[PDB]
Amino acid sequence: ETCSIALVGKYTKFSDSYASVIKALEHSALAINHKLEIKYIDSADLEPITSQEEPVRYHEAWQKLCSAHGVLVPGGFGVRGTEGKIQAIAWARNQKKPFLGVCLGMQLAVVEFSRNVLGWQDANSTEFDPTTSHPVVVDMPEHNPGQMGGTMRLGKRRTLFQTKNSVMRKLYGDADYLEERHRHRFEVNPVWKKCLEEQGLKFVGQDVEGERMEIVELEDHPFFVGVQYHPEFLSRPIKPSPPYFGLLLASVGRLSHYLQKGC
Amino acid sequence: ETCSIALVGKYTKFSDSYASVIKALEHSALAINHKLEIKYIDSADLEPITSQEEPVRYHEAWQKLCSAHGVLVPGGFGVRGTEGKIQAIAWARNQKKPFLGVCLGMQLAVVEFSRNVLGWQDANSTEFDPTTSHPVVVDMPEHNPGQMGGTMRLGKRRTLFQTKNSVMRKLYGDADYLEERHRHRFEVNPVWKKCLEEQGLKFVGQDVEGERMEIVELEDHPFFVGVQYHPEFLSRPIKPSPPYFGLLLASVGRLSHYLQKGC
């Protein structure tokens, strides 16, 4: 069968911007031996602005979104489509659709959670709103010596698991730590993390310092995870990265059997 | 070209419930020599209940609605889909899409107008809500002698034009009056008609007594009319009835030329 995934984003207008991302998905598709459809949904088309402009595209986008087996909100740049992106996120969370967010997507997912769970509707990313009542996403650059100002976190870095009870950890193979590609500047405000700890939004991965959050796994959800690091760079046809493979498995509704079968 | 019309309704689930209605449309299609698509949109699919249930159908319905060239909200029975029906009406009014309402459709259109123009959001039909703050649609049956209780208005009755400046009148041929099929029980509450007279919702057709309203033409709209009477019964291939022909013409964006050309 053809499993379809809703690529939701900005730069998502078809381009090869996602060539290695789709290729990573292909690695998983080959492993599982299924077919793969990449839907290209401009997140903007998910917004009521579009409804006002061309509601054909508006409803078409959402129709496609629902028809997708899983959804992917990758990182991206620009305030554009943030609303549609978050709407898609909330949609997937409510509908218990396999959700993978990467970087920005993870960041927005946390904001979405705060807004529609903690009620902090004014929660926001300082990346786009400096006047945020609950600065969820905050600029946390690295300040290495010899550098003027901060710098984006980039490179192969080590991420530590905060717990054994982690689906991703299991997918990785019960590793105490993992090393992944990094490319990202904004991080979780710990001021609110602590307000998310009693919540079912659990943060699983952290940098070595134990400060920056890299993995989040929403509890009580078939598949709703977010990562900051970029695994598509390391995924290979032989060794596919697990967040895409796992997403695929969830998109299929195989994942539980998979793990049960023996991972 | 194929001109499509959005049949919005209950009983709209495909059936031949609308065989003479579509046939009337066919009469117009033949006159104009164009092709005709009948979309069958369950008005229920236009409601947020459906969004909650199956948003695929929800967005699909609205996608189809937008893709339609004109819309038809005919009469019908039952409270079911009233919301989606009204939503479609407001949509068409806002989007300036050719709108023809018949009986219930006309009735709901008036309510919609009151709600979203007069702000009388609790305006309603007493047919379904006896506790209505602004009883727009009220039960006004005929009370003929020998009858116990009232009766539905039914039969070929004469309708009088209230004005010369009427698009429909022009389509009819400047007739002082018209005789049409009737089948309907609820009427416009005159208590609010008088509040609609300073409005751009103009009532053009009336029964002989000058009490029951039969034709309404929304001003400043390419085509937004409602009738109580049922012209599809009298439409013939040779002499197609004009509200369907005119609707077609509007759906095409020919109507102004048509009248200009000489009607």
Q: What's the rounded Cα separation, in Å, for the pair B139 and B125?
A: 9
Buried b / exposed e across A64-76, counting CB within 10 Å, b at 16+? bbbebbbbbbbbb
- Among candidate residues B88, B111, B96, the one with its CA nearest the CA of residue B201: B111
Residue A60 touches partner B, C-beta closer than 8 Å = yes
| Angle between the N-to-C axes of helices A55-67 and A82-95, in degrees from 0 to 180, rounded to the nearest 10 | 40
* A66 in contact with B, Cβ within 8 Å: yes
| CA neighbor of A201 nearest in space, from A51, A126, A125, A89 | A89
Chain B residues whose CB is inside 8 A of the A62 CB are 55, 58-59
The C-alpha atoms of residue B222 and residue B220 are separated, in whole angstroms, by: 7
Encoding tokens for residue B255?
A: 């109507």
**What is the distance of C-alpha A198 from the center of its chain?**
21
Q: Are A134 and A190 in contact (CB under 8 A)?
A: no
Alpha-carbon gap, residue B126 to B30, rounded angstroms: 40
The one catalytic residue in B103, B180, B184, B217 is B103
> CA nearest A94 in B: which residue?
B52
- Which tokens go with A153? 């976190």
Select the residue from A39, A47, A66, A67 to test the B interface by mutation, using most B Cβ atoms within 10 A: A66
How far apart are the CA of A171 and the nearest CA of chain B, in angstroms? 32
Contact assignment for B62 to A67 by CB distance below 8 Å: no
Taking CA–CA distances from B61, the nearest residue in chain A reads A59
Residues of chain A with Cβ-Cβ distance to B52 below 8 Å are none
The answer for residues whose C-beta is within 8 angstroms of residue A258's C-beta and 6 or more apart is A249
| A62 contact B CB<8A | yes
Give the residue on A whose Cα is nearest the Cα of B65. Answer: A56
Confirm if A47 and A81 have CB atoms less than 8 A apart.
yes
- A151 part of contact set with chain B, CB < 8 Å: no
Nearest Cβ partner for B55 among A56, A60, A62: A62
On the 0-12 / 13-18 / 19+ scale of CB atoms within 10 A, A181 is middle
A261 backbone dihedrals φ, ψ, rounded to 5°: -65, -30
Task: List the A35-42 sheet strands across, edge first.
Answer: A35-42, A2-9, A70-73, A99-102, A224-227, A213-218, A201-207, A153-161, A177-184
SS (H, E, C) A191-257: HHHHHHCCCCEEEEEEECCCCCEEEEEECCCCCEEEECCCHHHCCCCCCCCHHHHHHHHHHHCCHHH
CA distance to A7, A99, A174, A217, B110, per residue, from A222 (Å): 19, 9, 20, 10, 47
* Pairwise CA distance, residues A222 & B92, whole Å: 40
Distance CA B160, CA B163 (A): 9
Q: CA of B156 to nearest chain A CA: how many angstroms apart?
A: 41
Q: Residue B168 corresponds to which tokens in the numbers above? A: 């429909």
Closest CA of chain B from A108, distance in Å: 23
Find the CB nearest B62 among A55, A66, A67. Answer: A55
Could you tell me which of A78, A73, A77 has the C-alpha nearest to residue A247?
A73
Does A139 contact chain B (CB < 8 Å)? no
How far A91 CA sits from the closest chain B CA (Å)?
10
Least Cα separation, residue B118 to chain A (angstroms) = 22
Query: Residue A258 CB: number of other CB atoms within 10 A?
Result: 17
Class of domain A1-259: alpha beta
Residues contacting residue B150 through CB under 8 Å, at least 6 positions apart: B139, B140, B141, B142, B143, B185
Q: Is the CB of residue B55 less than 8 Å away from at least one CB of chain A?
A: yes
Residue matched to tokens 């964006």: B253
- Asked whether A16 and A82 are in contact (CB, 8 A), the reply is no
Partner B contacted by A53 (CB < 8 A): no
A55 touches chain B (CB under 8 A): yes
Burial of A134 (0-12, 13-18, 19+ CB in 10 A): middle
Can you give chain B as a three-state secondary structure string?
Answer: CEEEEEEEECCCCCCCCCHHHHHHHHHHHHHHCCEEEEEEEEHHHHCHHHHHHCHHHHHHHHHHHHHCCEEEECCCCCCCCHHHHHHHHHHHHHHCCCEEEECHHHHHHHHHHHHHHHCCCCEEECCCCCCCCEEEEEECCECCCCCCCCECEEEEEEEEECCCCCHHHHHHCCCCEEEEEEEECEEECHHHHHHHCCCCEEEEEEECCCCCEEEEEECCCCCEEEECCCHHHCCCCCCCCHHHHHHHHHHHCCHHHHHHHCC
Cβ–Cβ contacts within 10 Å for residue A105, how many? 26
CA distances to A50, A163, A229, B51, B169 from A95, rounded to whole Å, are: 22, 27, 26, 12, 52
Q: Do B59 and A67 touch (CB under 8 A)?
A: no
Residue A131's alpha-carbon distances to A122, A123, B64, in angstroms, are 10, 10, 41
Q: How far apart are CA A181 and CA A184, in angstroms?
A: 10
CB B134 within 8 A of CB B119: no
Could you tell me if B53 lies within 8 Å of chain A, comparing CB atoms?
Answer: no
**What is d(CA B49, CA B83) in angstroms, rounded to the nearest whole number?**
10
3-state SS record for chain A: CEEEEEEEECCCCCCCCCHHHHHHHHHHHHHHCCEEEEEEEEHHHHCHHHHHHCHHHHHHHHHHHHHCCEEEECCCCCCCCHHHHHHHHHHHHHHCCCEEEECHHHHHHHHHHHHHHHCCCCEEECCCCCCCCEEEEEECCECCCCCCCCECEEEEEEEEECCCCCHHHHHHCCCCEEEEEEEECEEECHHHHHHHCCCCEEEEEEECCCCCEEEEEECCCCCEEEECCCHHHCCCCCCCCHHHHHHHHHHHCCHHHHHHHCC
> What contacts A261, CB < 8 A, 6 or more positions away?
none
Closest to A183 in 3D by CA, of A43, A23, A20, A4: A20
Beta bridge partners of residue B161, listed in sequence order: B205
- Beta sheet of A186-188, edge-to-edge order: A123-125, A134-139, A186-188
Do the bridges between strand B99-102 and strand A213-218 make them parallel or antiparallel, or are there none, so unpaired?
A: unpaired
Backbone CA torsion sign across A73, A76, A81, A82: positive
Partner residue facing B66 (CB), from A56, A63, A67? A56
Is A127 within 8 Å of A139 (Cβ atoms)?
A: yes
Write the CA distances from A70 to A4, A73, A88, A101, B198, integer angstroms: 7, 10, 11, 11, 54
B201-207 vs B153-161, strand pairing mode: antiparallel
A96, HSE (Cβ side, Cα atoms, 13 Å): 5
Which residue bears the tokens 């919301």?
A: B83
B195 included as an active-site residue: no
The structure tokens listed for B75 are: 């009469």
| Structure token digits, residue A192 | 């609110």
- Tokens read off for A224: 């709703």
**Of A223, A226, A199, nearest to A213 (Cα)?**
A226
Check: CB of residue B91 under 8 Å from CB of residue B221.
Answer: no
Chain A contact present for B59, CB below 8 A:
yes
Cβ separation A59–B62 shorter than 8 A: yes
- How buried is A14 (Cβ within 10 angstroms: 0-12 exposed, 13-18 middle, 19+ buried)? exposed
Whether B103 is catalytic is yes
Q: Which two tokens stand for residue A97?
A: 């659709």
Alpha-carbon distance of B172 to B166, in angstroms, equals 10
* Distance of alpha carbon A237 from alpha carbon A29, whole angstroms: 10
Instruction: Identify all chain A residues contacting B56, using CB atoms and an 8 Å cutoff.
Output: 63, 66-67
Experimental method: cryo-EM
In this structure, the strands spanning B99-102 and B201-207 are: unpaired
Tokens of residue A178, six digits? 């993992």
Residues B249 and B258: their CA atoms lie apart, in Å, by 8
Tokens of B186: 């609820």
Distance CA A191, CA A193 (A): 6
Report the alpha-carbon distance of residue B113 to residue B123 in Å, rounded. Answer: 9
Tell me how far apart the alpha carbons of residues B129 and B120 are, in angstroms, rounded to a whole number. Answer: 15
